[PDB]
Structures are given as C-alpha cells and as structure tokens.
C-alpha cells in the first residue's frame, strides 16, 4: 500500500495522493465564484473570521499576483501563499524576459505545469489548493483560468470552487442557458459584482453582511480588491431592488 503514500500509479491507474490533495482543498470550508463582465472579471469568496482575537484585515484568500492578474485560492493558507509567492515570481520574471505582461492563461498553464511535476516526481507532494486566476487580458479580454492539484487547467465563462461549488455552478449554468451569452452584459464592474453576490446568495441560500465576503475585480490594466465599505455599498444596492 505504498502506492497510496507517493505519486505512483495504483493498479487501477490512479494517483491517490492527488485525489487526497483535492480533498484538502475544501478544508477551509470557503466557497468562491468568478464571473466575467463586458470589461471586467469579478471574483468573490466567503470570508470567515471565526476567532475574535484575529485581525480580520489580514484574513484573505485573494491575491494580487501582478498589476493585471488576481488569484483566489481554495485550500489551506500555507499552500495558498506558497502558490501566490511562486506566481508572483513567475509573472515578474516573465515580464523581464519577454518584455510584456504575463497573460492570465499563460500563468495558469505555468502553475499547472509545476503542479503536473508534483504528480510525477515522488519527492514533491501536490499542493492542496485550487487556483482561480483572473484578469482582463489585452488580447483575450476578461479571463478566468483555474488550476488544480492534478495539473489540470482550463478557461471558464464563469466558475465556482469550494464545498458547495455544485449549487453555485448549476445556478450559474441556469443563468447562462437563459441569457445565451458568455458573460454578464453589464457596463460597470459595480453591477457585475452585485450580480456575482446576488447569485451566490441564491445558490447558498444565505445572506451576507459586509464582513462575510471578499471581492476582487480585474479591469483593463489593473486588479484590485474591495474594502468592507465598497462591499457594503454593493450589498445596500442589492437590498434596495
């Protein structure tokens, strides 16, 4: 049973250590979701600060990888920050060597290749994280690319990750079946954020205060996260209609 401890094949052609790394990915009990506007890419994630001794401003699973790229992580924070540091190093190096900003999809591929290596080389363990990369790419426009512990990645019209990803996913699928377009047809990112929060509320059947969420927004030439007060203003607009 040592084929269970390291990344070698089981007799059914499976990699158990990879499968168990996916299981670690839900250990924070956080759900996240990402959607695309006409001009922007929005990512939201639940925020849970279960201890009163915590400084809540330091509790985050959203990362500013470069000026243009944001990353939300589903998984434990040590592995999340390992991935974040590496992604930051890769994006900076890419710009130095090739003279232009690393695209969201190329960074996702690169991080996915690194992950593939951990599934083939025995001395390295997979990271127990799923990485959702967002930007407004200069060639491809609003972009969502997500990586997992198998070294798989793909681009998304929209996506969700966490213990309740299925509910959010089906909710999002239902909306896009209706609208028949690959994105939220909204001018302003404020409204795309409101859409994103609204559909998370429907899908999880729970309400949010301003401290229950984390929001990241990508626009042309920048990614930024919202303060509790920008989020409050979002929540207020949702309630008043």
Partner 1 sequence: TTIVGVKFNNGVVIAADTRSTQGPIVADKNCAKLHRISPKIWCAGAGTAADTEAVTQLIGSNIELHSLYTSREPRVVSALQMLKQHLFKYQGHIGAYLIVAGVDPTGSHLFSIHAHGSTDVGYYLSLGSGSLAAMAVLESHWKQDLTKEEAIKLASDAIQAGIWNDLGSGSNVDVCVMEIGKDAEYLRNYLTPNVREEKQKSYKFPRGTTAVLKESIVNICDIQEE
Partner 2 sequence: TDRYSFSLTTFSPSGKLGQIDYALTAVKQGVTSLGIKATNGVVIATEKKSSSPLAMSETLSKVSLLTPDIGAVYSGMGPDYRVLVDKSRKVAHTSYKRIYGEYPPTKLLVSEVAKIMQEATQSGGVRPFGVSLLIAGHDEFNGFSLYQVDPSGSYFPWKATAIGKGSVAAKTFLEKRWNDELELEDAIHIALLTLKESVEGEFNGDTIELAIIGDENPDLLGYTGIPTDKGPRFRKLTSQEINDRLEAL
Partner 3 sequence: GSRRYDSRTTIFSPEGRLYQVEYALESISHAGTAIGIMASDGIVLAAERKVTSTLLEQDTSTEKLYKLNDKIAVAVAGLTADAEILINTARIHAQNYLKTYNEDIPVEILVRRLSDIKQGYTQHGGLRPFGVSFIYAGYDDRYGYQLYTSNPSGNYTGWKAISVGANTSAAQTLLQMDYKDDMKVDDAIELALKTLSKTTDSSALTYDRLEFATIRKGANDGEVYQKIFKPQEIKDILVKTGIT
100 binds, options Mg ion, partner 2, partner 1, none, Cβ within 5 to 8 A by partner type: partner 1
99 binds, options partner 3, partner 1, Mg ion, none, Cβ within 5 to 8 A by partner type: partner 1
Q: Which helix (H) or strand (E) holds 74?
A: strand 70-74
Tell me how far, at minimum, the Cβ of 8 lies from partner 3, in Å. 8
Check: CB of residue 33 under 8 Å from CB of residue 159: yes
**Please, what is the Cα angle at 162 between 75 and 152, to 5 degrees?**
70
Give me the 51-80 binding string for partner 3, x by CB under 8 A, dash otherwise: ------------------------------
Q: Which of 157, 191, 210, 222 binds partner 2 (CB under 8 A)?
A: 157
The dihedral through the CA atoms of 123, 92, 99, 131 has a sign that is: positive
- Give CA–CA dist 227/211, Å, rounded: 9
Sheet holding 222-225, edge to edge: 158-161, 32-36, 41-46, 213-219, 222-225
Residue 69 interacts with partner 1 (CB under 8 A)?
no
Tell me how far, at minimum, the Cβ of 2 lies from partner 3, in Å. 6
Check: CB of residue 28 under 8 Å from CB of residue 76: yes
- Give CA–CA dist 2/39, Å, rounded: 50
116 or 230: CB nearest partner 2: 116
Give me the 108-137 binding string for partner 3, x by CB under 8 A, dash otherwise: --------------xx--------------
Q: Which of 99, 177, 207, 239 binds partner 1 (CB under 8 A)?
A: 99
20 or 224: CB nearest Mg ion: 20
């Amino acid at each position: 049973g040592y084929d269970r401890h390291i990344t070698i094949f089981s007799p059914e052609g499976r990699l158990y250590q990879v499968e168990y790394a996916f299981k670690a990915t839900n250990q924070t009990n956080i759900n996240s979701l990402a959607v695309r506007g006409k001009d922007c890419t929005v990512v939201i994630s639940q925020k849970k600060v279960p201890d009163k001794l915590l400084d809540p401003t330091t509790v985050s699973y959203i990362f500013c990888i470069s000026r243009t790229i944001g990353m939300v992580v589903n998984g434990p924070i040590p592995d999340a920050r390992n991935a974040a540091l590496r992604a930051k190093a890769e994006a900076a190096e890419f710009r130095y060597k090739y003279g232009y900003d690393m695209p969201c999809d190329v960074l996702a591929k690169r991080m996915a290749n690194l992950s593939q290596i951990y599934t083939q080389r025995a001395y390295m363990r997979p990271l127990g994280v799923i990485l959702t990369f967002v930007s407004v790419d200069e060639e491809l426009g609003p972009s969502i690319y997500k990586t997992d512990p198998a070294g798989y990645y793909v681009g998304y019209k929209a996506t969700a990750t966490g213990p309740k990803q299925q509910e959010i996913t089906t909710n999002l699928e239902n909306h896009f079946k209706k609208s028949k377009i690959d994105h939220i047809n909204e001018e302003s990112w404020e409204k795309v954020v409101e859409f994103a929060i609204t559909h998370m509320i429907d899908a999880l059947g729970t309400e949010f205060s301003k401290n229950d969420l984390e929001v990241g927004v990508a626009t042309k030439d920048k990614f930024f996260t919202l303060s509790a007060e920008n989020i409050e203003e979002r929540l207020v607009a949702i309630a008043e209609q």
